[PDB]
RNA sequence: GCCGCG
């Protein structure tokens, strides 16, 4: 769980320790973290919000 | 799953799947057919004395083993004789140089070896066999585009593929086009050919946007405008990825 | 035009054909059995391949002849294909030999070697027969790599 | 100590092609100005493009109309390449009504007040049935760069009727730009260069106006270099506690503990809130009950707390 | 084996090879430069090869 | 240009068909551009027929013998309007265009016979040091898309 | 809507030493970073006013290859050393300077004669470490204001070889920019994500603050367009 | 079970 898959293309602007991750692929791998940040910032009190 | 010397004009040596099924799945060459029993046969041209006649004999795998068979790219004069005395040939699963009066059969054309899929690659003779294999297997995965665009560098087998694939609309008693619409084509058959009684016209109903097995779109758009004469066998509308009856 | 075929390729091919004709007539004389003539024909074709590749590398290595402030000298070629092979970025001497020099003697119907080789590179075309020969080796290689 | 190029000898090859000449330029400024101008011209030039269409009897792009030879997708693709000019309006609507035989061209568009059709020999569709008619309404907007029909979502604020067909927008009049630098005819000067820019557009934009606009854009961008220098949110929180209607005995104890906002209250865990004086176990349930009455369970964690 | 495995390949090698080569006659010959910065200035502005 | 490809994929893969197709496409588009130019300025028909005949009469002993003398004016104009985007030339599989034929086809279209032109960088405006192979290659879009992957 | 373009905000400057700077601008419209960087670099490197030494004269041996009387540094190294020294001349185009020394000790640029209009920014810059042991070394150089960079292709001055022998043809680097580099990266604001960020790395020989160099380049490039922006001006 | 992808 907490895993994804996609086609790889070349990014020559990257550093040696960096990769490129789509924003759609994220926000889905990192859903519980985003829930935690929303709840901790006071934006959404309930988990449903 | 290897290429046997009898695969020459019967089974394509280039087109085959890559990973698991290599050699187990093949495609017929352009000219290969089947005997009355079911064995693969291939056309050849008879040779009488030193001349190359035009009568065509279909040879099986067994029969071709004893005759001496010439090569497609052998120079000829106007009378049909061989330009050079010692020509290349295949005698019994091999190839060597033979005299001009010893040959018994000649290759009919230069596409005898390659299949329909691999006979579409221009400059195939300049490609590695494996890269040509991948190109042939990759041509079949192309997706039809919004607008078909003809190949600037083709082979000439594209008309055959487009017409005999059946996607296009081809006239069968072509006369003069009477009505053209983005959905229908109505042709008035010329009087020279006519079934007596009830006159007769031909109506072709093009299949508009329709899903395919691979969830692409199957679309036909007319090629003729109005009052344009049409002969038998001409293309009226080109299906998916076809431009004027030519595979694009 | 970046693949410069050596100018003497037809000459060495002609010498090889003359020698193979001479060995053919010598066999017809009956003083040589099939094994010796087969081994000798393979040997001469391999030597011809070696010399063709050497000539092509000779013509491709220092193909540039650029003059200087005094007279003219000879230095390393800037040919793009040689620049790729020598830099080690992509390709090797074998593939350049296939591209410009003769494709070489090759065969693998059952591991054996056919008498006459593929004398045509990839810059020039391959006949139907030569392509059908190259297909045996390509198929065996692909199947071996898969399995 | 520098010469200033002056736009001289503007020559018009055809209604689309154009050549613009800048006579006096210094030794190396020709290439710099040429490339800057070419990049600006190809990148961002205001133009006018068809944004949406609405044919009478059409419903979606993947349909056919009786009597017309081209599919609706083909009609939209033909309309995309149509070029117009409009003065002072950015939301022009062009009506096209034609019944008869043969092609329908941009020339038979109903003549609006100020809408110039650059090429009125630009065919867009054919009519093949005698008693067949085509009637459509085309929206033309003014934009800057390429904008796909899919990306614009702001137009979805108000619902669109079924039939409003969206086409992609190009907005760029310039199609091809090239330039060259040669020697000037200035003989008294030691050596001067002349720049010539050849343009190929859709006929929409005047060449002189295009070069002027590109130069203005470049100068405006450079103006920022000439002077470098420079060297708790959700409304239920942040409310007074005097809206939950607590008990009288709970009024003083909450004030005694300096809890004056709803948000600061929800951060106090049960284990320590019980240690508060004269809280009452039954009264502790009351505050929890009224706090859960709004959807907040006692014991959340926030990140800061402003005075407001 | 201990040999580095993150190494330039393909186009990087071609660029490094094309950069570090010499030809008998070019723009600039036996010219004397105070440092690499002058070399880059001479190449980029086009006064040297 | 529309597509930029890596040359390092050519020598190690041995696709010289790539390069020959690129050169042939450049020659075909050169002829198409010439036809479109002579059609733009409304040149009188006879010279257009003569040029198209010269284009079709090329090659070294080719079996195609298309002659426009039997063609009336209307069909020739229609064909020329159809060849505006380029001349769809074709090479059979193992007996197709030779080097000399490609080079002379390029010559007829007023293009460099070497098949390489001078390319200028689109961002800095500097000319690339070596000539670059530019042509027209016929590319396909496979069914493998990231929308489904 | 139209005619309105994104303007870079919060220009970032990271001053290094006194002649090295790294200036970051963000955001710019897509493809504008490359245009601005290329134009600024080209006019900073090819055409910028400045002054650098052009002619030299050493009493005694005047050949291009000389014994140098035992000055423990070949005259080629002398020309290289005096090439890099940067000067500021005020109100004059050409100016002659003279340096005469004796006694053990390296000769720096401070030891040349001082003129009011000539303002040399690196006086401790060393031409050489004197003649070996002790001896008298005398030289006269001439520096003129120029534009950009011009190598010593030829003299083409005076008559015969008088100007070469009195000059020795030192390469002139008029423009006061030691190195210019630009890099263009991805940057974004709000919903837009395909935006451009410019990073400019500048090093100057001196006499000019790198910020002053960029400002001067921007000034000249902008006032090169006044023939098109004057009438087409908002104000 | 079949087909394909690296």
From Swiss-Prot, chain B:
Protein modification: Acetylated on several lysine residues in the presence of glucose.
Effect after changing residue 22 to S: Resistant to antibiotics salinamide A and B
Stated consequence of mutating residue 130 to H/K: Resistant to antibiotics salinamide A and B
Record's description of how this protein is used: Co-administration of salinamide and rifampicin or salinamide and myxopyronin suppresses the emergence of resistance to both antibiotics.
Physiological role: DNA-dependent RNA polymerase (RNAP) catalyzes the transcription of DNA into RNA using the four ribonucleoside triphosphates as substrates. Resistance to the antibiotics salinamide A, salinamide B, rifampicin, streptolydigin, CBR703, myxopyronin, and lipiarmycin can result from mutations in this protein.
Similarity annotation: Belongs to the RNA polymerase beta chain family.
Assembly: The RNAP catalytic core consists of 2 alpha, 1 beta, 1 beta' and 1 omega subunit. When a sigma factor is associated with the core the holoenzyme is formed, which can initiate transcription. The rRNA transcription and antitermination complex (rrnTAC) consists of RNAP, NusA, NusB, NusE (rpsJ), NusG, SubB, ribosomal protein S4, DNA and precursor rRNA; S4 is more flexible than other subunits. In pull-down experiments interacts with CedA.
Descriptive protein name: DNA-directed RNA polymerase subunit beta
Species: Escherichia coli (strain K12)
Lineage: Bacteria, Pseudomonadati, Pseudomonadota, Gammaproteobacteria, Enterobacterales
Part of the intact protein present: 548 to 795 of 1342
From Swiss-Prot, chain E:
Biotechnology: Co-administration of salinamide and rifampicin or salinamide and myxopyronin suppresses the emergence of resistance to both antibiotics.
Function (record text): DNA-dependent RNA polymerase (RNAP) catalyzes the transcription of DNA into RNA using the four ribonucleoside triphosphates as substrates. Resistance to the antibiotics salinamide A, salinamide B, rifampicin, streptolydigin, CBR703, myxopyronin, and lipiarmycin can result from mutations in this protein.
Protein name, as recorded: DNA-directed RNA polymerase subunit beta'
Family designation: Belongs to the RNA polymerase beta' chain family.
Assembly, per entry: The RNAP catalytic core consists of 2 alpha, 1 beta, 1 beta' and 1 omega subunit. When a sigma factor is associated with the core the holoenzyme is formed, which can initiate transcription. The rRNA transcription and antitermination complex (rrnTAC) consists of RNAP, NusA, NusB, NusE (rpsJ), NusG, SubB, ribosomal protein S4, DNA and precursor rRNA; S4 is more flexible than other subunits.
Highest taxon of the lineage: Bacteria
Record PTM: Acetylated on several lysine residues in the presence of glucose.
Range covered out of full length: 495 to 543 of 1407
From Swiss-Prot, chain F:
Biotechnology: Co-administration of salinamide and rifampicin or salinamide and myxopyronin suppresses the emergence of resistance to both antibiotics.
PTM text: Acetylated on several lysine residues in the presence of glucose.
Modification N6-acetyllysine occurs at: 107
Domain of life assignment: Bacteria
Quaternary structure note: The RNAP catalytic core consists of 2 alpha, 1 beta, 1 beta' and 1 omega subunit. When a sigma factor is associated with the core the holoenzyme is formed, which can initiate transcription. The rRNA transcription and antitermination complex (rrnTAC) consists of RNAP, NusA, NusB, NusE (rpsJ), NusG, SubB, ribosomal protein S4, DNA and precursor rRNA; S4 is more flexible than other subunits. In pull-down experiments interacts with CedA. (Microbial infection) Interacts (via flap domain) with Escherichia phage lambda antitermination protein Q; this interaction renders bacterial RNAP resistant to transcription pausing and allows it to read through termination signals.
Family affiliation: Belongs to the RNA polymerase beta chain family.
Function: DNA-dependent RNA polymerase (RNAP) catalyzes the transcription of DNA into RNA using the four ribonucleoside triphosphates as substrates.
Annotated protein name in UniProt: DNA-directed RNA polymerase subunit beta
Residues shown, of full length: 1094 to 1242 of 1342
UniProtKB/Swiss-Prot annotation, chain G:
Family membership: Belongs to the RNA polymerase alpha chain family.
Impact noted for substituting residue 42 to C: In rpoA112; temperature-sensitive, blocks RNA polymerase assembly
GO terms under biological process: bacterial-type flagellum assembly; bacterial-type flagellum-dependent cell motility; cell motility; cellular response to cell envelope stress; DNA-templated transcription initiation; intracellular iron ion homeostasis; nitrate assimilation; regulation of DNA-templated transcription elongation
Lineage: Bacteria, Pseudomonadati, Pseudomonadota, Gammaproteobacteria, Enterobacterales
Subunit (UniProt): Homodimer. The RNAP catalytic core consists of 2 alpha, 1 beta, 1 beta' and 1 omega subunit. When a sigma factor is associated with the core the holoenzyme is formed, which can initiate transcription. Both the N- and C-terminus interact with different regions of transcriptional regulator CRP. The rRNA transcription and antitermination complex (rrnTAC) consists of RNAP, NusA, NusB, NusE (rpsJ), NusG, SubB, ribosomal protein S4, DNA and precursor rRNA; S4 is more flexible than other subunits.
Included range, full protein: 4 to 238 of 329
Protein name as catalogued: DNA-directed RNA polymerase subunit alpha
Membrane spanning stretches: none
Entry GO terms, CC: cytoplasm; cytosol; cytosolic DNA-directed RNA polymerase complex; membrane; transcription elongation factor complex
Region ranges (Required for interaction with Crp at class II promoters): 159-162
Native species: Escherichia coli (strain K12)
Enzyme Commission designation: 2.7.7.6
Record bears the keyword Transcription: yes
A molecular function (GO) term: protein dimerization activity
Annotated stretches, region: Alpha N-terminal domain (alpha-NTD): 1-232
